Amino acid sequence: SPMSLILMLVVFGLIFYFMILRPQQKRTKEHKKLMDS
Amino acid sequence: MPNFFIDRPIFAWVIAIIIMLAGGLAILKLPVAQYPTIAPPAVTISASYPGADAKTVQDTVTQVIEQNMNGIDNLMYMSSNSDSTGTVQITLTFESGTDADIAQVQVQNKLQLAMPLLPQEVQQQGVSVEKSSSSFLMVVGVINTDGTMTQEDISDYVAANMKDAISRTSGVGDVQLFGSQYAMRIWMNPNELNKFQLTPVDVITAIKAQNAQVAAGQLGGTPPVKGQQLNASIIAQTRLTSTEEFGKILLKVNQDGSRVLLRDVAKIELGGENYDIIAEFNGQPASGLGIKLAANALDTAAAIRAELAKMEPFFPSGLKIVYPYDTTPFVKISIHEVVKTLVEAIILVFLVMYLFLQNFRATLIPTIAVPVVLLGTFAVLAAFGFSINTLTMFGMVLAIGLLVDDAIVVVENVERVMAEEGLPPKEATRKSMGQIQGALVGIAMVLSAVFVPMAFFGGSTGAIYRQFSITIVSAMALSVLVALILTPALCATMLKPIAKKGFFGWFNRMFEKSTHHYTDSVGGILRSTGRYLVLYLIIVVGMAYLFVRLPSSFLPDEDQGVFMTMVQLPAGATQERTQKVLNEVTHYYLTKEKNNVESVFAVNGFGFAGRGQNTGIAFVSLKDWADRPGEENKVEAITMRATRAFSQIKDAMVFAFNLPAIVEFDFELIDQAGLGHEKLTQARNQLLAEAAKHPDMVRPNGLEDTPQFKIDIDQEKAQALGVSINDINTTLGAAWGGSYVNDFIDRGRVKKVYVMSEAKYRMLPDDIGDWYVRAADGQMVPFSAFSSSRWEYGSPRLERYNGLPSMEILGQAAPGKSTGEAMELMEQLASKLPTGVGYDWTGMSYQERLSGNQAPSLYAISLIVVFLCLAALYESWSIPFSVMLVVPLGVIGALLAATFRGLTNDVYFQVGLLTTIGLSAKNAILIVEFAKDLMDKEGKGLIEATLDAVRMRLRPILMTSLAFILGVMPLVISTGAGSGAQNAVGTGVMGGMVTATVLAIFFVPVFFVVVRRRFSRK
Amino acid sequence: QLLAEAAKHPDMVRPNGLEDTPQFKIDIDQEKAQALGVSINDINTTLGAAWGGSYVNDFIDRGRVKKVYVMSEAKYRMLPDDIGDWYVRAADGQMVPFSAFSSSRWEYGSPRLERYNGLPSMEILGQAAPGKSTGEAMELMEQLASKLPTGVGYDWTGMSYQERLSGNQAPSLYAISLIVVFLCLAALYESWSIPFS
Amino acid sequence: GADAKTVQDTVTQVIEQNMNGIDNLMYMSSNSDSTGTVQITLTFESGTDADIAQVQVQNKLQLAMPLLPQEVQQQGVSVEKSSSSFLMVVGVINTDGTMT
Amino acid sequence: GMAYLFVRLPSSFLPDEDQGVFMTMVQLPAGATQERTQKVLNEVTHYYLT
Ligand SMILES: CC1(C)S[C@@H]2[C@H](NC(=O)[C@H](N)c3ccccc3)C(=O)N2[C@H]1C(=O)O
Ligand SMILES: CC1(C)S[C@@H]2[C@H](NC(=O)[C@H](N)c3ccccc3)C(=O)N2[C@H]1C(=O)O
Ligand SMILES: CC1(C)S[C@@H]2[C@H](NC(=O)[C@H](N)c3ccccc3)C(=O)N2[C@H]1C(=O)O
């Protein structure tokens, strides 16, 4: 059915709120790298 | 061929279009199927002996038939039932994968080679033989709208037009029916008979006499008299029709020239053949059609529904057709997901690209690099023996993500250069594919060492792992080429460089940093390795612990808008009783489950493990998914609670349950040392009872012994009176069990003519006297003049395993984990039993190697075909372990995932990690690759090389994940339509793809570096 | 009604079976039969036996098994009347004519008789030989006869059921090569724009 | 010695009706000569196992023939495949006018 | 032209290839004794040989 307007939207919204959520989890596991000390 | 196919676009394009068009056809040529033939096909010889009993039948039919099959090929295990009614069902199973056709045709003969021995009654009724498949593809039932239909007329009507109407569709099945095609019934009556000095015999005789088509040559045929000009055949007595004629039959004529009609001795009417199965639809008089099968399984179904109009008008009083059980929607509502998925995924991918390549003028590449493949994939599916089904569908869906992957993994690096070397569209795209080249191959050929290996598996399980395996291998195929001959091509045509806004296109900056932080990071972490390596193992440990802490399921308990519920009454329960207790059942659903329970096909006298007029089953059709919100409004619970409600329903056991979500524990005892049923039933006693003292919070499947009525015809006294020990036996069973006399055409159709004494005279023991036999003397005689009674126990149903007296058990230990122990008790537990009593495994139990009990066998294998395949990269040994090692990471991810989610290690899951591991392997490669390259391709630079790589390769890795990890969020949530499977899958990879990127990257530069420092140490 | 109607649109359609033939009904009168004491069996056998031929035993004829048939020689079975001729025996031990308990009467019947799919049916041979477009020749029938009673349905047998013939489908695969050829030829370096020639 | 009536109902019927489950039954034709003759021809989709396509049937015939009239069983029920009709039809004749 | 021409050409399965063989049928009225069917066959047989 013509729900592309409520789905394509879920996309723009989904992507961002999910990518950084990936990037973030990759910045902390990046800093906790303090194991160099 | 890339550097080659890149200067010639059209030949490329064109070779892709071909593959496309490989679907325009592939789609079609394909049989949509609910499920992959997942069972051992199996011949099943049905027999009957009207009015016998568990004794005779067991010994006079099952025996003359089980014993006369000395030589057959692939006899896996010969099951057996023997209903007290005449019914006999030797089912013969065969190793999953035989010539169902010859596997059965190879039998029948050995049946003929023995049937001449069967009792006349048994031959005559007709011995039967079939194959058993997915039970009832969809069960249509008929009902009267205008309250004008009998419990039998709908079966009858169904019997003349519909039943045989089955095949109006494009394709049809083996078995179907309920009810009873009409049958001329001559209910009798002892008093009148004795009056007219008549025997049931006379009747049965008077029938075969005055009613039976006769052959009568013709005038002026064969060697004529020369000169005859007229030629016409003669017509003598014919079959009977009018329910009246029969009544008008002639039984005898006394001294006053007066006659006695069959009428005068029995009520004659148009009835059914047997009155043992009454069926109801929302408690409305109704009969159905057991369409046990029917090609595009999906299309057939929809056509019986098309054929439907051919009978709407037909017959004045309602007759509205309803479809209580239909295993069809699960296809439209599956094909969809695939699409929706592909659609949502193809779109979902498009977007990512923009936030990364920001070029629309090159976001299209993938949008071609995906369908094209999933198309050709459809193709290579009909290539082999695979059907567009739910199983092979996920792969499509699953593989989709992966399928996508390659795309960018091919468009980024081919563009990475676009900025790095600032080189020209075409000139760059070559060099681009000048590296991921081999990588791409091995990478791909490597996974084939993790999906394919799994294909080749057991018997039933593998029947899916492969329906899986190749479904993804297939898709992993089109993968490289389409990504090697079309992508490189579709990329070299459209695109434009530079060796270097704000708005939301600042993003890139935010990204750059994280690139840098990664580069700045890994490098430092590298320096001091061990610190991170010891952490690796802790995880390794954890994963394991975690793993062994997760359960094992075959396949979910997938919710299907269908569910059965059973009814077993006490030995002796009249039809009435079984019905009284069925009616309650039917109530509850229509009563207290209103919001969902659409209907309730109920059938009095028919249970899957028990039969006669004690059993009963109800086909509950819940309202579709979108109309049952919450969990509690779903099957699992609707079933959970109902059975709970039933409990307090004293003096009969009842319960319901969801359907297996795929068509399919059982323990067999044997009477081997020659003992008997009684002793054998005496042992299954000690066992089922003992086994009962190790449980938390085991059962026989047969029925238990029923009271029976012994007669003992006293020969002497019998002969002293002058009565044929025949006229007796016939005059008995005849009137109490029913004889199949002649046949008669009823409105253009042949039917039976049964004779049995009307109920009134056969409800009670005493009633036996009632019956009078005739002696030569010419004077009637009571049975009682030479018969005596006495009660003893017997066995409703009776069974034997492999021509041997046996009893089945249903021992279930559902912890979920290690059932290979649950069996051990039994085999030894019962080892304390008498002599002759042996054991063995039937059904699901005999299929030793299941999924998970063997999974550990093929896995350690890929640890060969993958290590092996990956070593083929120039110089592998010493290095291989790094990619290998990357595996546990994504693994402890998928694990934690299914763990938290309270999920079990299901097949789709057993599938999952593989995908993941594929990916866990995937990315790693693309890193150790450039890593390897740099160090040799040009100047040496270990640590300084790997980082450099760990960088170049990050954007892609991250890229893909955003996609895949987005083209899976869909499935993990959903529990509305199917989805349970879509739960284990989806959740399977997210948990994987996550812990497979954040955690998996840092270690590769570690694993690889340390695996390299492992060389100069010798 | 149909074969006859279809007959009013032709230029210059037929049932394949045979048509109904005259037959001879017998009707053995049981009562009268029993009053005389003659087994309704000895009868039926003594009839068909002598008029249709029974397959009795077998016998080896010069090293080969063969049949042993019994049937009354022609002389006594050419005409209706001849039925009386035949005498059956009653328990009493005294012969009895058929005629003592048999009656005749003629009715029509059907030489050959047929049914399609276990269902009573009759075949037709509707031929429209212009040569071109027979997919129309069928349409009349299906609707033409649609004006018929109830129970009377239709369907296609033999050559007719084999819907797609050569030429009725030829146009399907042809337009195809307009793909696999255009397609194949495009593979020549740079095809598009040129292929059409 | 039967006729179009009996045969139609006492043989064709006991046999056409006792074939509830068969694979690839394209269309079941039928004739029933007034002489006893009965010819259920069973067609199958161009391309099947002529061998099993037929062996797959016979059983369902046995699963019903015990009902046929004694005369009919006895004469022997038959079953075949139909191919290019008569590859070449030889006939025999008497030269010396001595043959019946 | 081609087109017009094309659509102007008939459609046959395969020729009516000539084969040195040919059948001819004989159907008499309901009741026709063997004799009769033969009398009318004999004529048929004649014509050809005749
Ligand atoms: C779907 C199939 C092609 S694979 C499956 C099974 N074949 C094997 O198990 C295989 N030989 C094997 C592998 C490992 C150890 C021992 C044996 C078999 O049989 N089935 C086929 C079929 O039924 O068509
Ligand atoms: C209708 C089809 C989908 S199945 C049929 C046949 N496929 C097979 O025999 C089977 N997969 C096979 C067995 C052994 C080796 C290789 C392949 C084939 O080709 N046809 C397809 C088609 O022409 O489209
Ligand atoms: C000689 C054959 C190899 S091709 C012929 C036919 N196969 C097809 O029509 C084919 N699947 C098809 C093509 C286009 C549309 C739909 C279906 C079939 O079956 N026959 C084979 C056989 O009998 O051996």
Swiss-Prot record, chain A:
TM spans (from-to): 1-21
Q: Which locations, inside or outside the cell, does it occupy?
A: Cell inner membrane
The chain's coiled-coil residues are none
The family line of this record is:
Belongs to the YajC family.
- What's the stated role of this polypeptide? The SecYEG-SecDF-YajC-YidC holo-translocon (HTL) protein secretase/insertase is a supercomplex required for protein secretion, insertion of proteins into membranes, and assembly of membrane protein complexes. The SecYEG complex is essential for assembly of a number of proteins and complexes, assembly is facilitated in the presence of the SecDF-YajC-YidC subcomplex.
- Describe, as the record does, how this protein assembles with itself and its partners: Part of the SecDF-YidC-YajC translocase complex; YajC is also present in a homooligomeric complex in excess of the other components. The SecDF-YidC-YajC translocase forms a supercomplex with SecYEG, called the holo-translocon (HTL). The stoichiometry of the super complex may be SecYEG:YidC:SecDF 4:3:1, YajC is in the reconstituted complex (with SecDF) but as no antibody is available it could not be quantified.
- Protein name as it appears in the record: Sec translocon accessory complex subunit YajC
Gene giving rise to this polypeptide: yajC
UniProtKB/Swiss-Prot annotation, chain B:
Q: Does the keyword Membrane apply?
A: yes
- Cytoplasmic-side stretches of the chain, per the record, are 1-9, 355-363, 412-436, 489-529, 871-880, 926-954
Name the protein family: Belongs to the resistance-nodulation-cell division (RND) (TC 2.A.6) family.
Q: Which residues cross the membrane?
A: 10-28, 335-354, 364-383, 390-411, 437-455, 464-488, 530-546, 854-870, 881-900, 907-925, 955-974, 981-1000
Q: Name one GO biological process term.
A: enterobactin transport
The protein's assembly and partners: Homotrimer, with large domains that extend into the periplasm, interacts with AcrA and TolC. AcrA may be required to stably link this protein and TolC. Interacts with AcrZ. Part of the AcrA-AcrB-AcrZ-TolC efflux pump.
Q: List the disulfide bonds.
A: none
Parts of the chain on the Periplasmic side = 29-334, 384-389, 456-463, 547-853, 901-906, 975-980
Q: Name one GO molecular function term.
A: identical protein binding
Summarize the protein's role. Answer: AcrA-AcrB-AcrZ-TolC is a drug efflux protein complex with broad substrate specificity that uses the proton motive force to export substrates.
What keywords is this UniProt entry annotated with? Cell inner membrane, Cell membrane, Membrane, Transmembrane, Transmembrane helix, Transport
Stated membrane topology is: Multi-pass membrane protein
Q: Which InterPro entries match?
A: AcrB_DN_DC_subdom, Acrflvin-R, MdtF-like
The record's listing under Pfam families reads: ACR_tran (PF00873)
How is this protein induced?
Positively regulated by MarA, Rob and SoxS transcriptional regulators (at protein level).
Q: What is this protein called?
A: Multidrug efflux pump subunit AcrB
Keyword Signal listed: no
Question: From what organism does this protein derive?
Answer: Escherichia coli (strain K12)
The UniProt entry, under SUPFAM superfamilies, shows: Multidrug efflux transporter AcrB pore domain, PN1, PN2, PC1 and PC2 subdomains, Multidrug efflux transporter AcrB TolC docking domain, DN and DC subdomains, Multidrug efflux transporter AcrB transmembrane domain
Q: Where in the cell is it found?
A: Cell inner membrane
Swiss-Prot record, chain D:
Q: Give the protein's biological function.
A: AcrA-AcrB-AcrZ-TolC is a drug efflux protein complex with broad substrate specificity that uses the proton motive force to export substrates. (Microbial infection) Involved in contact-dependent growth inhibition (CDI), acts downstream of BamA, the receptor for CDI. Its role in CDI is independent of the AcrA-AcrB-TolC efflux pump complex.
Q: What is this protein called?
A: Multidrug efflux pump subunit AcrB
The consequence of inactivating this gene is: Loss of susceptibility to contact-dependent growth inhibition (CDI); inhibiting cells still contact the target.
Induction of the gene = Positively regulated by MarA, Rob and SoxS transcriptional regulators (at protein level).
State the organism named in the record. Answer: Escherichia coli (strain K12)
According to the record's subunit comment, the protein's assembly and interactions are:
Homotrimer, with large domains that extend into the periplasm, interacts with AcrA and TolC. AcrA may be required to stably link this protein and TolC. Interacts with AcrZ. Part of the AcrA-AcrB-AcrZ-TolC efflux pump.
Q: Which family is annotated?
A: Belongs to the resistance-nodulation-cell division (RND) (TC 2.A.6) family.
Q: Where in the cell is it found?
A: Cell inner membrane
**From which residue to which, out of the full length, is covered?**
51 to 150 of 1049
